[PDB]
Amino acid sequence: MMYLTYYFIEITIFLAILCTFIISAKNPMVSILYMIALFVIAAMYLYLIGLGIFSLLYIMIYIGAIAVLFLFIITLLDNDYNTIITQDWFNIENTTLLTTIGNVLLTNNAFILLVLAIVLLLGIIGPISITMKHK
Amino acid sequence: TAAGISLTGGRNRCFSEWQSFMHCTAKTDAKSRAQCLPNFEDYMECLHHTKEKARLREIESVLKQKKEGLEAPPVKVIPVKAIGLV
Amino acid sequence: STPLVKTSVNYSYGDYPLIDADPHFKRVVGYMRPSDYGVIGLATAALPAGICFAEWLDPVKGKFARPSVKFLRVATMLGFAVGFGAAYARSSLRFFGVTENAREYKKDEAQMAARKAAGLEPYGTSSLTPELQEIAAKNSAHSIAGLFIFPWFNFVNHPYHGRE
Amino acid sequence: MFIGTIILVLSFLGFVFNRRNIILAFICLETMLLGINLILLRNSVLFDDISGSLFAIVIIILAGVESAIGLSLLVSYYRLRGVINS
Amino acid sequence: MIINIVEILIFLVCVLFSVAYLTVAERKTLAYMQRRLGPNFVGYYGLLQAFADAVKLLLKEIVLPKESNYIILVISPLITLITALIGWVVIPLGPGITLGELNLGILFSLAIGSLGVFGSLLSGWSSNSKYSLLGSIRSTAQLISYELILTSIFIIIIMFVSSLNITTIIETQRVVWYCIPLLPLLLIFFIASVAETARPPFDLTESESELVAGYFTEYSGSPFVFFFLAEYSNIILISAFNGYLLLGGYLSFNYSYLFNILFNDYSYVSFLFEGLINSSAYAIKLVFLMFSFIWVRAAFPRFTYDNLINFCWIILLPLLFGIFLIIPSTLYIFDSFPTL
Amino acid sequence: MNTFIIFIILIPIVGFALLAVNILLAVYKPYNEKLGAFECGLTSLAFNAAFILVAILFLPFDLEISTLLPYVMSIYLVSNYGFTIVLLFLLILIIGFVYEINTNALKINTDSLIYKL
Amino acid sequence: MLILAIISLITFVSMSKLSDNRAIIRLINIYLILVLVLDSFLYLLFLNNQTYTVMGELLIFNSFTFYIDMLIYFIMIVISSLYGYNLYNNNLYKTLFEPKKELIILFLINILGALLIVHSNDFITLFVAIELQSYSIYLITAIYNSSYKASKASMLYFFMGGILSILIAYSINTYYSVLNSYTLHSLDSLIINTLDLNLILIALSLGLLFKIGIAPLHKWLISIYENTPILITIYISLIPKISILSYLVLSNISINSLVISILAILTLLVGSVGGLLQIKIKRLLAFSGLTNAGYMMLLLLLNNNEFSYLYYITQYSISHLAIFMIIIFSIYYINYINNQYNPIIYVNQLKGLIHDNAYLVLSMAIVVFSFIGIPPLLGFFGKLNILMSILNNGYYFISIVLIVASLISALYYLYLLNVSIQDKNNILINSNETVSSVLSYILSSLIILITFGFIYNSLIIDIFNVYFN
Numbered sequence A: 001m002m003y004l005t006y007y008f009i010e011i012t013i014f015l016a017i018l019c020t021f022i023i024s025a026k027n028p029m030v031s032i033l034y035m036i037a038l039f040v041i042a043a044m045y046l047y048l049i050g051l052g053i054f055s056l057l058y059i060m061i062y063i064g065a066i067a068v069l070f071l072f073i074i075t076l077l078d079n080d081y082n083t084i085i086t087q088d089w090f091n092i093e094n095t096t097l098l099t100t101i102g103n104v105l106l107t108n109n110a111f112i113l114l115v116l117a118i119v120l121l122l123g124i125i126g127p128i129s130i131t132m133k134h135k
Numbered sequence B: 001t002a003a004g005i006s007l008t009g010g011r012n013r014c015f016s017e018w019q020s021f022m023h024c025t026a027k028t029d030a031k032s033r034a035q036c037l038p039n040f041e042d043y044m045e046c047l048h049h050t051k052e053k054a055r056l057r058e059i060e061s062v063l064k065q066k067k068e069g070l071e072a073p074p075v076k077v078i079p080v081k082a083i084g085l086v
Numbered sequence C: 001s002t003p004l005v006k007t008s009v010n011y012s013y014g015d016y017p018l019i020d021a022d023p024h025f026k027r028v029v030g031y032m033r034p035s036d037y038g039v040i041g042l043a044t045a046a047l048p049a050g051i052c053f054a055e056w057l058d059p060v061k062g063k064f065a066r067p068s069v070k071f072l073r074v075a076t077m078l079g080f081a082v083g084f085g086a087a088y089a090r091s092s093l094r095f096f097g098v099t100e101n102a103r104e105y106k107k108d109e110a111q112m113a114a115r116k117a118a119g120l121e122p123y124g125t126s127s128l129t130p131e132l133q134e135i136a137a138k139n140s141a142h143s144i145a146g147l148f149i150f151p152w153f154n155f156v157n158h159p160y161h162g163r164e
Numbered sequence D: 001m002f003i004g005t006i007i008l009v010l011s012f013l014g015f016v017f018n019r020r021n022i023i024l025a026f027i028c029l030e031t032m033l034l035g036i037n038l039i040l041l042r043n044s045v046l047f048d049d050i051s052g053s054l055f056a057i058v059i060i061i062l063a064g065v066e067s068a069i070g071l072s073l074l075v076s077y078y079r080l081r082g083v084i085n086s
Numbered sequence E: 001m002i003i004n005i006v007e008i009l010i011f012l013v014c015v016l017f018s019v020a021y022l023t024v025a026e027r028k029t030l031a032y033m034q035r036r037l038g039p040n041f042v043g044y045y046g047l048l049q050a051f052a053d054a055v056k057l058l059l060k061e062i063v064l065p066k067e068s069n070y071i072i073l074v075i076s077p078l079i080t081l082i083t084a085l086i087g088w089v090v091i092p093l094g095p096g097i098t099l100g101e102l103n104l105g106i107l108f109s110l111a112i113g114s115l116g117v118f119g120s121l122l123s124g125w126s127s128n129s130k131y132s133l134l135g136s137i138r139s140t141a142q143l144i145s146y147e148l149i150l151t152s153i154f155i156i157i158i159m160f161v162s163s164l165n166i167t168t169i170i171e172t173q174r175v176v177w178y179c180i181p182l183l184p185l186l187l188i189f190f191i192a193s194v195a196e197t198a199r200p201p202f203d204l205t206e207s208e209s210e211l212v213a214g215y216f217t218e219y220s221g222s223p224f225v226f227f228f229l230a231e232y233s234n235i236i237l238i239s240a241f242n243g244y245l246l247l248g249g250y251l252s253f254n255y256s257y258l259f260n261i262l263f264n265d266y267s268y269v270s271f272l273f274e275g276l277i278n279s280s281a282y283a284i285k286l287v288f289l290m291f292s293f294i295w296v297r298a299a300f301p302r303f304t305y306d307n308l309i310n311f312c313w314i315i316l317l318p319l320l321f322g323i324f325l326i327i328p329s330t331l332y333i334f335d336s337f338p339t340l
Numbered sequence F: 001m002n003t004f005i006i007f008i009i010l011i012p013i014v015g016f017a018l019l020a021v022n023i024l025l026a027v028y029k030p031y032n033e034k035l036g037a038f039e040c041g042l043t044s045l046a047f048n049a050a051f052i053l054v055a056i057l058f059l060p061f062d063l064e065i066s067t068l069l070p071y072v073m074s075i076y077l078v079s080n081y082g083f084t085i086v087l088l089f090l091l092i093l094i095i096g097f098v099y100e101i102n103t104n105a106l107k108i109n110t111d112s113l114i115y116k117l
Numbered sequence G: 001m002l003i004l005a006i007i008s009l010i011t012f013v014s015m016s017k018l019s020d021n022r023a024i025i026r027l028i029n030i031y032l033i034l035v036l037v038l039d040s041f042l043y044l045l046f047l048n049n050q051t052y053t054v055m056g057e058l059l060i061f062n063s064f065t066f067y068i069d070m071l072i073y074f075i076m077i078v079i080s081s082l083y084g085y086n087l088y089n090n091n092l093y094k095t096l097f098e099p100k101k102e103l104i105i106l107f108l109i110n111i112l113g114a115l116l117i118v119h120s121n122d123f124i125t126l127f128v129a130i131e132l133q134s135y136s137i138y139l140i141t142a143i144y145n146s147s148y149k150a151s152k153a154s155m156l157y158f159f160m161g162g163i164l165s166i167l168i169a170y171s172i173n174t175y176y177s178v179l180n181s182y183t184l185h186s187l188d189s190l191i192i193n194t195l196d197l198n199l200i201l202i203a204l205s206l207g208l209l210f211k212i213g214i215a216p217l218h219k220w221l222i223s224i225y226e227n228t229p230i231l232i233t234i235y236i237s238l239i240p241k242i243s244i245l246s247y248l249v250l251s252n253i254s255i256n257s258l259v260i261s262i263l264a265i266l267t268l269l270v271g272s273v274g275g276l277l278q279i280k281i282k283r284l285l286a287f288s289g290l291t292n293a294g295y296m297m298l299l300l301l302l303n304n305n306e307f308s309y310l311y312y313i314t315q316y317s318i319s320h321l322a323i324f325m326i327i328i329f330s331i332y333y334i335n336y337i338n339n340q341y342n343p344i345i346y347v348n349q350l351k352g353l354i355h356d357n358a359y360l361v362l363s364m365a366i367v368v369f370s371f372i373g374i375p376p377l378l379g380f381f382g383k384l385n386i387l388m389s390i391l392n393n394g395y396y397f398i399s400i401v402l403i404v405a406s407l408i409s410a411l412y413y414l415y416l417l418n419v420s421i422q423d424k425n426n427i428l429i430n431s432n433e434t435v436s437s438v439l440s441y442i443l444s445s446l447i448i449l450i451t452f453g454f455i456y457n458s459l460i461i462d463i464f465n466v467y468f469n
């Protein structure tokens, strides 16, 4: 019971080694399904280290979009010490990881955001430019 | 830049000694810069806990080489359900 | 409008005195000289004149033909953008004390004195909190240096203008 | 640091010693980015610093656009040949 | 531990039986809109119809075609059913009254939803019947395209709340339901929830007339049970998303006056009565939505693939980006950026 | 061991139990004619660019939509500043959307009869 | 201006027909010229070597980056002229050189990526700019999808660039893990003495340098350069080199690095020796580019490399543009067009060009002797400044190797002139056709710069002493 949550980190690590079955898969599909399994293991590990919101974002994006594209396309083509956790009360707001990321990304690094807008603009223009034959 | 911002928008875990070290590097010059090497070791120490781990290593090593009993107010581990019991 | 961080005072970017380290967009457009409007007009004329002369030199389809009205309209639009960027840059450079700025210096002194007489803030009141004001300042300070790459302006009434 | 490192190295070796297929190649690219990001995020947590997580978000987005462009390139490559013999 | 078990069994039984009876309710409602009766013979008033179909299908042989990946063909329906049911863990029937009280409840809903295209994407590869392949590619396209609309409406709503806890989003609606200021957004969520669920008129994915049956052409027995169950459970769950994003969830009316008349102190009677009121409000909203799914199925002919893709990417998505621009603009104009 | 994790564990067990009931109770008599794939009763691949293109353009647009999550979770803290930044971000993306519309990216005999007298 | 151009151009190219491509490209050519001339006066900001940190310490602006920026605009102007104007008005050249619909937008976005690489003050900005440039350059490689070789090239490029980008991201994150920082500005002499960052910084440098194709990872890039359309190769072989090299020079993270020393030596040897047995024009030019990238890599081992690097990169950009343009012009006099993406392929196809166009061969001679480094052409002074720097800093053996590599590469530089001044049996008698005025004027301007730049050397050093000191 306590050894479970203790070795939970080491279990995700072992399953990740094992899943990286991706290389040895006879069928590339099967390889893509094992890639999805690896991504779920990654989401599991992310929650354990305290970054669950990232577990959910990974599920949303890499499995929800990137794995979906992968499958679409291929159907179509032929350190032993323990840390002290201490409390203090200086934080009166309900500020989480997502709020802080929004704060810094939209104020301290607005430039990075607009450059990412240009990068996504590229991610739109390019595929159209090379997969479509005009006129 | 986001340097110095913690996961909750405050100051990160290792801000204080970093800010002390910057107070150094502001006051000193290139010739005098070696003058606060100490602030930089403090910063790297907060970051990586290396001398702390070494000190704990020597403490554990000598502790496990001891058969005599220890008479000091001890540390007790309790289940999470048992916080505040009795 | 109290600064949260320490700034240099009357720092010399050039041979002339400093008026404003990060001037507000309204000031930079407000202090523009007739020569700067001449620059805007010259760019606005030059860009379609440029396309027409280019067609003269080396016709696109062998035989000379005047560029269509769509392209000329484009040309005017983009030329005005380039001219305005150039003119804004000239005015801001005056503000930093890099080009000659006697007229702008006097006009600023008068405007600041009038504002002080009225009891208002020298740089106006901001709808942002001071932390967002420092962040806006650190984002807009000397952003005219990247005029070639991206346009960025100061639209925020912050107090970090580098004066006394 | 451990799970991310091993995903990175095993995906790299899968990429290099691929002599089976190009899809394996795409997948090794993606999983390398995964391992990089996991190392990054563990470091972010240990430092209680937001810069690590900000760069993790940016990697996520850029890996998205990179996957989009790469699959578009593969499709354009296929359009001429009809078959991927790797 | 015991209380946790009892809560989970109660919730699970209610959800499974509600899905089972939604099928009967669909048949009966369509029947009465078609001047006929629908199931009224298997069980009193046809109330055991769904269990009859269930038992039959569980006694049916499983056929694994020769060219098929049998593992994938059997596991794809299983994963789609699991995700469809996992989606229910965050749905509240009252303030904090849910199996999972996550501060990232919305993000959980969206993620588990995005795990919903894999049944369609995988079955075509597993069946190998050609009809299944065409259906699978077209479905994957349609589903992802409309998932975009659903995610965009989620974002627009969070613009008003600034929270990813579902209960908080519901509580903010005591002032007004969000379907009042955003009526056009509610219409689009219905049109898109119909499409994302693959229901008529947008049933191109498994339309019998264009393609016999659909991706499920080859699914007999329990795998067919799983696709069926996942489809109706997803209908109810996306009606739930609609309910708490736009219809105020479990909020009906201010019953403070009434409770002060009836009771004079807190008691298990009053807690139960409040629980019943909240749950009844939320369940009546769910019932109106399910009825609307059935109504739209009764009234309209199907779209073509080109038609629905054109819809989503040329009529809906521009409007949603326009709303992305106009909602924060209205917040800024009136100084009403919501606090955390 | 809260309700969340127990429910999450419980669902796949129910799925596997229904599957095992089917395997245990149903007959199983495969033969060649039954194993054939069904295509209207008798035995018996180029695609269009827009098929590729819907899928491929899903990923950038999904990323655009999900890039607004940090914004809507921090709207008040970023005030009228972040507001303007996110307008610029949205307009830049809207430009790419306009390009997509005008190029008609996702979309898939009138001669007269003349006699030489 | 660049962002505004990109936005407008996306709108127009959406709303314009395929026949308007060249007119659009002429429009942008003139726009860039106008920006270069009207906004040049911003140099004045950089007087006394004044440095500015901008965008919340993400971007850094000094005289060096301003100069690199102007140079990149000049290169973009020249390169866009080749697409915006027809050499000849015959059917053959309409088939040979037609601009794709989206090509100009890709060019501008890749230029933006390069400028953001140059100005990058923080590692997040560096990585985003690297990925922006890498993606745009993948697409530019792939936009001519009728070519089998171009598609194969774009795919190989995608994979090699992806691996190098992962190496770069790994280096960035290791630097973060050790220092909890994303800026090199946090580094100081005390910090470098205290901590061993050598491994991390060299991994970052190597990840950047293998993207411009330094040995022993050259061959994939030379193959890509060989297999792309010629007007694409003129671009993709130049801009990434400039951006990456300029960033590395500005950052100075590999001073006296033993590994960079060995790799620069190896790059010189492979670029010089390996280009000898080449028979294809573009492979010859790619090995030229490899040797010159070696010459510039040497400058990453020392401080105060700004003058030598700027002079060398400018003269190299001019010589590279000019030699590609000469190869382009010599197409009109070949008797066999190999295909529509690469009309001329083998060096021997220039044989006897002096009998068809004497002054084209004069220009060719001038550019070749610049590459060899014959004074008083620009190439000589570029090599002279580089030797001055490296000998001032005690790189004796590397100087000897540089001598030897220049000697060896002179052989396959003169191969071109050798076959060009030989004699061809069928000699042009007459022609009504006129080469386009604009491109001929541009080629002439480049040639005159290479020939008579040295008269301004002392004026240039005087200006430099006030803007970079």
Ligand SMILES: CCCCC/C=C/C/C=C\CCCCCCCC(=O)O[C@H](COC(=O)CCCCCCCCCCCCCCC)COP(=O)([O-])OCC[N+](C)(C)C
Pocket (backbone or CB within 6 Å): G036, G037, G040, G041, G043, G063, G066, G067, G070, G071, G074, G306, G307, G310, G311, G312, G314, G315, G378, G449, G452, G453, G454, G456, G460, G461, G463, G464, G467
């Ligand atoms: C009316 C505006 C037109 C200006 C357009 C400029 C376009 C640049 C395009 C290509 C670069 C091409 C050659 C650049 C010249 C360097 C200027 C300079 O002096 O270099 C210094 C720094 O020296 C260095 O590190 C070394 C530079 C290496 C040059 C190698 C070539 C030497 C031979 C060229 C001879 C010049 C031809 C004259 C023929 C009559 C930067 O000077 P600066 O930063 O103060 O800016 C100058 C003031 N400006 C903005 C108004 C123009």
